[PDB]
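Submission sheet (multi-component)
Chains listed below:
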Amino acid sequence: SSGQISIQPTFSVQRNLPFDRPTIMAAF
Amino acid sequence: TDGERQNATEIRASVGKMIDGIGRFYIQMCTELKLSDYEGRLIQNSLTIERMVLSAFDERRNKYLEEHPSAGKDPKKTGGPIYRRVDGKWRRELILYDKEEIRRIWRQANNGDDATAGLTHMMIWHSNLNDATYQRTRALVRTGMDPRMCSLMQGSTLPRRSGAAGAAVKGVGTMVMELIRMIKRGINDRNFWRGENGRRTRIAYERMCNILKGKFQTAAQRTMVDQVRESRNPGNAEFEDLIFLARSALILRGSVAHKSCLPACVYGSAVASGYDFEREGYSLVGIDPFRLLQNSQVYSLIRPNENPAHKSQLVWMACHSAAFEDLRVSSFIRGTKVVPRGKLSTRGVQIASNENMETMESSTLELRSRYWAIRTRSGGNTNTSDMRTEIIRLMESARPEDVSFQGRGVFELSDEKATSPIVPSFEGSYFFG
Amino acid sequence: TDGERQNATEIRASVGKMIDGIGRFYIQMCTELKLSDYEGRLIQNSLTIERMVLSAFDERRNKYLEEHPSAGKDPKKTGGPIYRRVDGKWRRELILYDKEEIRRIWRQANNGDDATAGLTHMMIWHSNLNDATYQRTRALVRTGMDPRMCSLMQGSTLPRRSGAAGAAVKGVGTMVMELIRMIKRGINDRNFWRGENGRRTRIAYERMCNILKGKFQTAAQRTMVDQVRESRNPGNAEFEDLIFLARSALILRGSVAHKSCLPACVYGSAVASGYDFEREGYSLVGIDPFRLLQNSQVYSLIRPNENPAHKSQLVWMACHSAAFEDLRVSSFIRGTKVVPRGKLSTRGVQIASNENMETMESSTLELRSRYWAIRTRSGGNTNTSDMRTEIIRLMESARPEDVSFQGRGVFELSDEKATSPIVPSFEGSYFFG
Amino acid sequence: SSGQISIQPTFSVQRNLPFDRPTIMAAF
Amino acid sequence: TDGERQNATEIRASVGKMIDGIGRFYIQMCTELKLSDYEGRLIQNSLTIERMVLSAFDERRNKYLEEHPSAGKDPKKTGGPIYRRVDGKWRRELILYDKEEIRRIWRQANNGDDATAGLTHMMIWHSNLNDATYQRTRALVRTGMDPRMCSLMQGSTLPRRSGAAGAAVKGVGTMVMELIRMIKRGINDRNFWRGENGRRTRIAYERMCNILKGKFQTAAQRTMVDQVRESRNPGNAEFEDLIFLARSALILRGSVAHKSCLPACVYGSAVASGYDFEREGYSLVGIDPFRLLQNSQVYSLIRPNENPAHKSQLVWMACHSAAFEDLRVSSFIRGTKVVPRGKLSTRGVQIASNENMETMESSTLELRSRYWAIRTRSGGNTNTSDMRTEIIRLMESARPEDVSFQGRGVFELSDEKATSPIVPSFEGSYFFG
Amino acid sequence: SSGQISIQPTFSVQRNLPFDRPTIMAAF
Amino acid sequence: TDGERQNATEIRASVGKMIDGIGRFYIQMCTELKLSDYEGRLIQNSLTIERMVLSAFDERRNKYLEEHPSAGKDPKKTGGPIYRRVDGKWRRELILYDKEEIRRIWRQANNGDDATAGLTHMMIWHSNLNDATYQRTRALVRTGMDPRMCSLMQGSTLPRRSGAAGAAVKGVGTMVMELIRMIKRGINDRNFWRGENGRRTRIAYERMCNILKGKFQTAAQRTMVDQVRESRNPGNAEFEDLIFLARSALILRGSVAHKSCLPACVYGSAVASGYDFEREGYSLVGIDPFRLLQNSQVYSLIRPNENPAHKSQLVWMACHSAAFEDLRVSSFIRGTKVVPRGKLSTRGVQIASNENMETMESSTLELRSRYWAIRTRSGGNTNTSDMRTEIIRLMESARPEDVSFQGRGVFELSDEKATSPIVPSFEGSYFFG
Amino acid sequence: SSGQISIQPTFSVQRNLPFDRPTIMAAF
RNA sequence: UCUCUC
RNA sequence: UCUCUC
RNA sequence: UCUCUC
RNA sequence: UCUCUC
RNA sequence: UCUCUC
RNA sequence: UCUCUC
RNA sequence: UCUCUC
RNA sequence: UCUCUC
RNA sequence: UCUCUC
RNA sequence: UCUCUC
Ligand SMILES: *[C][C]([O])[C]O[C][C][C][N]C(=O)C1=[C]C(C2=C3[C]=[C]C(=O)[C]C3=OC3=C2[C]=[C]C(=O)[C]3)=C(C([O])=O)[C]=[C]1
Ligand SMILES: *[C][C]([O])[C]O[C][C][C][N]C(=O)C1=[C]C(C2=C3[C]=[C]C(=O)[C]C3=OC3=C2[C]=[C]C(=O)[C]3)=C(C([O])=O)[C]=[C]1
Ligand SMILES: *[C][C]([O])[C]O[C][C][C][N]C(=O)C1=[C]C(C2=C3[C]=[C]C(=O)[C]C3=OC3=C2[C]=[C]C(=O)[C]3)=C(C([O])=O)[C]=[C]1
Ligand SMILES: *[C][C]([O])[C]O[C][C][C][N]C(=O)C1=[C]C(C2=C3[C]=[C]C(=O)[C]C3=OC3=C2[C]=[C]C(=O)[C]3)=C(C([O])=O)[C]=[C]1
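Outcome: structure written.
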């Protein structure tokens, strides 16, 4: 099932910016 | 900072005067529509008023409607649902205003000035609400883009008439969508990119691709987009390159501006309360919106079997453009856990015509946040075959653990000067998942 | 949705104007052929008229016929059977029209515009009828493909001159057939893929393989098709890979567009009744076709010992491109149980020349549906050795019980805005079984 | 005897999309 | 060797750091359990500590236990028997530790790193002990395999969560057992190899069969295993082929890695004594384990009427994974004749709960060897009907007299650089006979 | 009676690797 | 040839100046170590000096040693065994030099220039010696490669810091080994190919695979290696393809450069004798090395019961990189029959520390050849399923009788211009057999 | 027993480049 | 994952 | 300007 | 690398 | 002067 | 399952 | 097809 | 600042 | 044919 | 938080 | 040789 995969950092706050690495890199 | 303080204060004064114009226009329109204080603070009434203003100034649509009149709708009148409370229960009435009248009221509010900046502000607020409410996966699949990159769809519903502010706030995915639509249009009909209209279409293609280039962060993406722009009659290869560029934006994030564009009801209440945004100034990224939201009461219509807390959270994320933001930081800033879209027991804010306005009730929206933070236009720590291989290497090197915005935290509402940041310590993390 | 509403309304206006052009062209041709209302509503007369229009604009065939005249058929005249009712009984007459005359009538109907989109619409209607009527297992076995994958043969009879619409509506099996025919042609004669014609053939191969790549859903199929395209002089290995790709499309379904292209008689009747498709708009996937079919009477010729209900069901499935659709949902939407092809007591709609038009009668077609639903261009829940193993693993993981289109149901004809869906509760399921 | 083995979903309706699994997977 | 010395030293440093982590973790846990030096050197206490560590990090079992709590055992606590000596006699007490606490201690020992390599090392030590102690002929007969091929059951008790080290150390018989279990599971329920779970099961089948292929030596076995893997829904024929492959491994031996994984008590004593495995390095196949065993004292609990020499021999063979090794070479290396399993007057090392800890005594284990030798991952001199006939010809050509490892002997403990080998001159030869 | 029939060479030492040839080859 | 003569003379001058730098550096270091002429001509002393130079300039190892000091060895000093003759008998002494001192001496010898080319030359000489002396079948079996393809292990011991010369001289088997090690490393830990280190690892993988592609001869191998490189996260399939590529290199030989890198003692003697390599020029593939070897005396230490002729043959094959060359042509060129490795009664040139330097004697090495020939970087007459089948067809078509290098023979030492070749007329043919 | 199976032609001399064909092709 | 933006 | 479910 | 200068 | 999370 | 598309 | 131009 | 043909 | 390069 | 050589 | 892993 599809869904959000990344995060867009609207707030300037110390973060780690998650993203689903196996699914994004599976396209290559 | 430096001697650019004077420049930073002139911009504050100008945005304050635009906010004052919006607020006093809302006050005047509330007086001309005979709405009480409770109805004037309704979010649906504010949405209707804003839509009427935006429709009144739409030059191209008005010209087309004038030349091709619609079915039973004269092209010189605007309107929308107006929700008025009588004997305890709510009731909707369709109002109709002359568009010349609306334009005259808007100009009189802004001291005889057009002030398209205020209209752009209202449009950006609407776009933020739409992004926080609805998913356009249908437009994604129709254009061939993966419906998984919904996080790059910031500012997708913005009309083209939005100026530089609209281009700054709209995301990389929307730019890729516009470029891909142009590519498909040229693929369908080869008379595209040729003739008098060919000049205009090439100019628009150039400009949108240039600002997409300016939106990116790393040099490899910035060079691939330049390679895409150079092709005179782009085809499937350029479309594939744009798809790859959009996919790379999920890890190598692009710089997208985020602004807190509040509904016109809040500005109208502030102007009625005596706030002088012209004197005090304003800033769409600083404490000014957060402080204003803290002291403002806004009411909204709740459909039967709906949670006011979920609708208030939706309206808050729309106000602060936190639709695609990490859920942990959003919950930390708000102080109340922010529930993803799938578990929100609420539909859109706008009420459809085919609804019974007798089982509907109004609930006060809790637009209060425990902390406040500065909105950023930046990405993260982002530190033709050759370009693709380089970008793939960059994305493979990146991990979902690198700490970005090092040393930058969240401030308290008392800390107006952002003297003491609070770095959060860290559950779900995607809204549209 | 979002601010793309204006774009969604311009497309509606354009398709409405093409439908208006088709309808008023049919009206003009009915006036020029001296057909009464009953004959003008005959489906065979509409088929003949449409075929004459398509033949008039066929550039390549007309050029070849001009350079190589046929036996007793001059290359500047078109025609077809015209069925006229006299003294109660039917009678066929072969009519002959100048092709310049037909082109002039078509251009005058569309306000001096070529409007190849309307011709593509007529061709897609013909292709849907052919798919719903006849099985081309002979072309399947001749090209080496399994005759079991007849469900992927959507839009197989479409001529190459169809634009992007033809490529969008045609199925994965037809693309595999075209590619395999090219492979066989190159295997027979090695001078293929070489010379001036080699450039053109490679370009066409590239383009068809690219759009087949765009048709697929999962990444593994999308990569295997790219591997197939890369080979400069493809041979038996590429043909085997294409066979495997087509076989995998039965479980990992590809995205094939479905549009409701109605016969020209319905559009002509609507234009005569005063409907303005330009003002009201149109959509080949929305309620507009279903609503139009509900209010239209269309007659058809019934051969001796044939069931009008079966022919009406065949025409309905042709109109809505439900030839390969699940029988349960088709019967649920129509409200009358849809009988598979094997138990349909009817032959094709088109009447052959060697038929006695004195035992034939006309029956009104019941093109009414109890519900209506939105046609989709999507597959289902689809969630070189390495690629083949990955695809086999994906197909083995899939089951014929996974629920797709979750939460999407069927609407009533009164529900024009699709507000309240009706999810069906679930007999045979294959038409061509 | 040959025949249709899969289903192509023209309508956007909650369905299960039948296919004859033993015969399709018998080819591998 | 060659310039790969640097690579050979980095691996030594990494395994030394993992050994240091294990040892200092054992030291910390001994301090947190308040065990004296004698109790800290008990092999049963070390086994209990190791089992608690392995249970704490078991993700799948912990998740299942959390979702399905057991009877009277909360899923967030681990533990095991702790044997403490008071007033001369031994006494067991069941200890209970929070699993978060154990994970925190393990991470702190390894400098905040997960270090799953250390856990794999502990699991391999446990598997070697189980292989040297118990025969799983019951699992052999249950899966249909001959109970005579117990020599191929190396690393049978290893859990699936072991990484590449577990796959390298586990024998051919265990791989055949896993594949046969998958075959039986697919035979029982035909919905196997089909659907979403079908993809995962096919992927796992592929991977296990590939590494079994890599485990073999001769080309014919390597091709028959590839033939077995190719079948999409394997049945009885593939199971029979796997049985034949396992039977052929008794003569055409497969390459199985052998490592000296010592109990955590030895590493803890070495770390307490000041040994820096990070600086000096380590190697599971070289002199490093043999030297470490020579200088270490380890105590074990002796049941009434048991021989300490037999238990020490069992523990030594478990430490060096010599369970299935030729008895003559084992006795030559150890310097004391190694008695087969049938004549060992000892039960398993682990003490059951239903035992009286008042007739039990502790004996020092003689983990000393007269010589030392390099453990090998190799077979010997190994120099669908067609493949079976070829393999049968190969096995018939082989004899139990061919000399393998020509020129390679056994070294003395003083010969740290393996300069001068001692070729043995050659009684029973099977441990489990 | 069943039992161990082969030898697995853990140590790299000059050996002959015994196995019970009549019983192993009796299966074929 | 053509006007590229000037380019061919500049390269000769540059390599001559690097040879002069090496020789005068050796002279200076002999003066700083107080070695007589006999000791200065010892091959072991030259090996020690060269190793000290290479260790002094090793940036990464020196940095790591500085950050992690070793046990009793300070990271700022180098050294090695120095064999000095006193009262007739030999004696070894461990010397220790500051690494800054060695770097300063090297830079002063090359006129203040780093001259990494000279260091690469010394490393290539060491690698040729190691290839001619030792077999790394252990690294072959550890990586899964067949120990039969030892002929492709040219330049296996070369460190990564070698520049383009190291990549040119190293064989196909070593490239396959490096790629397979990377594959295994990525298989063990999936965080490989991901993140900041993922970028670097992908870049290195790209580059090594590209130069392996450039190493091959036929188009099919060159395309399969490209297919292997394209996979983003390669697994077992890519490893199997690399294994097949390496196996195909035994028949479809790859182009591997061969250079005559002589020990530094010969260059030092030539510089002391007054030879100006800068003026006269040099060439690692022409007559220049053969002529230099003819006029040079080099001594070596002979272990008790060893044949000086066998050690001289080993040193000659190391000098000319004839380790994997056909024995017949090697014996023809040398004029003395070249004995395979199995029948060489000699151990390695380097003397271990645990040796008694009182039964050891020195013997003059016969580095004289009857003829001389030009070393070639070429293969022979070499005239994903599809690529594998094509390669298998190519290998099956090839025979071990096709004559390669047609018309090219061997020259006499008097024939400096290679005017008159001598085609040999043709016993064992494999060194490592 | 394993050993060298091919020849790598370092010298540019008219040769036949031996290799053990039955053992190399036995792998396929 | 395209419930409509050809 | 033809025709045919398998 | 945009913690504010649209 | 419309509407809809996927 | 090739009743025609070599 | 590299008999020399790293 | 080590060493070893298989 | 892995006497050490997990 | 169990146990058992065959 | 299945004292439990259907
Ligand atoms: C706030 C600030 O910072 C911002 O910055 C960034 C931005 C800049 N600007 C820009 O870029 C702009 C753009 C535009 C556009 C255009 C132009 C021209 C043409 O031709 C076309 C176009 O398009 C577009 C745009 C925008 C948006 C979109 O979407 C599209 C402008 C106008 O338009 O005017 C301006 C500016
Ligand atoms: C409706 C919409 O959505 C649709 O989308 C999808 C589609 C797109 N388009 C496309 O792709 C196209 C295609 C085509 C083609 C071609 C081209 C070129 C060449 O060369 C060839 C070809 O081929 C073909 C096609 C189509 C179809 C078929 O079948 C084949 C086009 C043209 O042609 O023009 C266009 C577009
Ligand atoms: C030490 C060294 O040398 C070693 O080498 C050899 C080994 C390699 N590795 C491998 O192979 C591996 C494996 C594995 C596995 C898997 C995977 C995937 C799937 O799916 C499944 C599986 O299974 C298994 C395994 C292992 C073991 C067993 O038993 C089973 C891995 C993982 O898992 O991860 C890794 C690696
Ligand atoms: C003498 C002459 O002729 C030679 O030629 C051929 C060669 C060319 N060169 C090349 O290729 C090179 C390479 C290299 C490398 C690299 C790079 C980059 C990366 O990333 C990586 C790598 O790796 C490697 C190499 C080499 C060798 C090896 O083994 C590996 C280079 C550097 O490094 O720098 C250069 C050049």
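Remark: Residues 90 and 358 of chain C are 6 Å apart (CA to CA).
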